[PDB]
């Protein structure tokens, strides 16, 4: 999409409709005449396009109105209301830009942000941008959270997020322009080696993949068209449903052999009755010959009765010879029909063990995407965020994804090594109690008007709690935390002294031996300048490889590489790194998934703020003080870095609107 309308698409907005968020800000216009709505819609799209076309510099209200044309640059309170809405909810002037109007020295209100992960940083940059006092509290000794980026010498390898899912409507597109990030595309040609290390041929490879995508659609049909979404009270998982579809396809292969052989039998029985006529008729024929001969043995001249017997017998002998010939006519067909069916049988099996083993790798990939074994993924909802896919090749970051978060952290008050242990929020403000991660006895107290919590969902889910809320989070929130899924995947980093793989191939598979180990080192990435190979441990295997030393893991990795490329071309790796996300206490997991029994609705619950009770009973309802942001709060773009970033921008506008006052709704 291109023009002003490309700006609306690139900003995740319908170019020709007012969205629900905009109506709330501008009820006068959306309840008004169709002409006004179009004016507004243009002013919106046109400002977006301006900011987009150059995102390294602030877009001031002046700059905007300058470059509108009449009739649009006529009403200047409409242009001012539009620009201010845009700027507030991070649709323009977000990320890293040069400030035209230096932020005023006197701040307004005070906000503690828990976590300098990407979502934290995003809101923190935006809140400060709005003239607020913003301090971030980070438990780790580095920013970025789940965006990690191993760096030693010339080696660079992220152990957290590493792919940008396509710039078509992606806030990361803007940040990329804003910060140089080496962006490389990903050729999608991936060949899968078998357990024995022999490359799988295209025949199986293309066949299984088509069947895989065919079994997936089958579940989606079980879900939406048969409402098979609940079984003995427990809601149906994707894994469950894939089994009920592989079983029903193995049933069908059998029902198909039965009613084929059952055509043979019926056909053979038809023959049985035909050969019984034919052998009882060759008996009447043999006996009749004994009579016509014997009757012809009465030499002529004979009485007319004796002559009648010879002719009559010779006739029933010609009658029964017509019959027997008509029956070996019918016999011919049946003999040939049998020879057809016997050498024209139907499929003998649904999936060979070698074929299914390949399929189990395709299920590993799917447990990679959602970071959890498929039994857990809600059958109805696991793919509910699929409508909001960006458009474009997926990319990697050659310099490490760590540079984005670090850039965002420029100019922000970040207290590293600071583990929040109690969040305490009351009708009159909040105080956040943190310790120092190195000597934990040393205690810190932070007072503030509002707390924005970007704690990972796995942290929020820890039992016993790793962070205490005072007062407790309400049941509608803690139920949401239980229901929601937070899964796990890990990576292994292999640093060599020479490229010994196919350099024109970014990623190549390894097929597992079992279903149970389908995730265990199932995929490798050449992504980087340097000689670095990346190994992914997904599925049920991720949670179990965390209990195994790095050597044992690097051990298995070499083995599978070895068979795939020979035992004399795979040298010992120089530097090796293994992650352990669900083991990490600041992540307790990789990212969230829609667990069975959860829905997308929970992702919205996570994002509702908490308004505390009144201190003095009889006082009026207070302000919301506790806010949430992060990957598990943005229901339309979860488990991603862009989703995190959008969540951070979202809460910054929501928090600002609360303590700075939205004067763009009049």
């Amino acid at each position: 999409p291109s023009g002003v309308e490309g700006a609306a698409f690139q900003s995740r907005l319908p170019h020709d409709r007012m969205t629900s968020q905009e109506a709330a800000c501008f009820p006068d216009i959306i309840s008004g005449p169709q002409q006004t709505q179009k004016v507004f819609l243009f002013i919106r799209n046109r400002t977006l396009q301006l900011w987009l076309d150059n995102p390294k510099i602030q877009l001031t209200f002046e700059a905007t109105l300058q470059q509108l044309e009449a009739p649009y640059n006529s009403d200047t309170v409409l242009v001012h209301r539009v620009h201010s809405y845009l700027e507030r909810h991070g649709l323009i002037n977000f990320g890293i830009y040069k400030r035209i109007k230096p932020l005023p020295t006197k701040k307004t209100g005070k906000v503690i942000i828990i976590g300098s992960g990407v979502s934290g940083l995003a809101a923190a940059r935006q809140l400060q941008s709005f003239g607020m006092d913003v301090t971030l509290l980070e438990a780790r000794d580095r920013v970025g959270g789940r965006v990690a980026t191993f760096r030693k010498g010339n080696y660079v390898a992220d152990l957290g997020a590493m792919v940008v899912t396509g710039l078509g409507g992606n806030p990361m597109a803007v940040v990329s322009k804003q910060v140089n990030m080496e962006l490389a595309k990903i050729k999608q040609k991936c060949p899968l080696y078998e357990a024995n290390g022999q490359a799988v041929p295209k025949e199986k490879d293309e066949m299984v993949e088509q069947e895989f995508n065919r079994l997936l659609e089958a579940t989606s049909y079980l879900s939406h068209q048969l409402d098979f979404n609940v079984l003995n009270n427990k809601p149906v998982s994707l894994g469950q449903a894939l089994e009920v579809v592989i079983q029903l396809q193995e049933k069908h292969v059998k029902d198909e052999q039965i009613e084929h052989w059952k055509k043979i039998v019926k056909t053979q029985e038809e023959l049985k009755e035909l050969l019984n006529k034919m052998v009882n008729l060759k008996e009447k024929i043999k006996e009749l010959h004994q009579q016509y001969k014997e009757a012809s043995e009465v030499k002529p001249p004979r009485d007319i009765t004796a002559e009648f017997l010879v002719k009559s017998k010779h006739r029933d002998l010609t009658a029964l010879c017509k019959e027997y010939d008509e029956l070996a006519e019918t016999q011919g067909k049946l003999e040939e029909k049998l020879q057809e069916l016997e050498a024209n049988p139907p499929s003998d099996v649904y999936l060979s063990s070698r074929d299914r083993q390949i399929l189990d790798w395709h299920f590993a990939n799917l447990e990679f995407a959602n970071a959890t074994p498929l039994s857990t993924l809600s059958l109805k909802h696991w793919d509910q965020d699929d409508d909001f896919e960006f458009t474009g090749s997926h990319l990697t970051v050659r310099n490490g994804y760590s540079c984005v978060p670090v850039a965002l952290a420029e100019g922000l008050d970040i207290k590293l090594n600071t583990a929040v242990r109690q969040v305490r929020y009351t009708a009159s403000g909040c105080e956040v109690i943190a310790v120092n991660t190195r000597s934990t006895s040393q205690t810190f107290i932070y007072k503030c008007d509002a707390v924005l919590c970007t704690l990972p969902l796995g942290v929020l889910k820890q039992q016993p709690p790793a962070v205490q809320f005072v007062p407790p989070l309400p049941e509608w929130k803690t139920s949401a935390v239980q229901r929601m899924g937070f899964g796990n995947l890990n990576k292994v980093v292999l640093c060599f002294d020479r490229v010994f793989w196919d350099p024109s191939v970014n990623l190549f598979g390894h097929v597992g031996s079992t279903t149970a180990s389908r995730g265990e080192l199932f995929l490798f990435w050449n992504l980087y300048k340097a000689p670095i190979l990346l190994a992914l441990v997904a599925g049920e295997a991720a949670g179990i490889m965390e209990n195994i030393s790095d050597d044992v893991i690097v051990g298995r990795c070499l083995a599978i590489l070895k068979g795939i490329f020979g035992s004399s071309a795979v040298p010992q790796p120089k530097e090796t790194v293994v992650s352990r996300w669900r083991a990490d206490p600041w992540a307790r997991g990789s990212y969230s998934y829609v667990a069975a029994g959860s829905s997308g609705n929970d992702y919205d619950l996570m994002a509702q703020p908490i308004t505390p009770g009144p201190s003095i009973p009889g006082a009026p309802q207070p302000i919301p003080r506790l806010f949430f942001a992060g990957e598990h709060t943005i229901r339309n773009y979860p488990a991603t870095v862009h989703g995190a970033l959008l969540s951070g921008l979202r809460e910054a506008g929501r928090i600002a609107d609360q303590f700075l006052g939205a004067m763009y709704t009049l």
């Binding site: 999608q188 799917l366 995407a369 959602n370 793919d383 509910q384």
Partner: peptide, 4 residues
């Protein structure tokens, strides 16, 4: 939810 379905990658590459």
């Amino acid at each position: 939810p379905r990658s590459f």
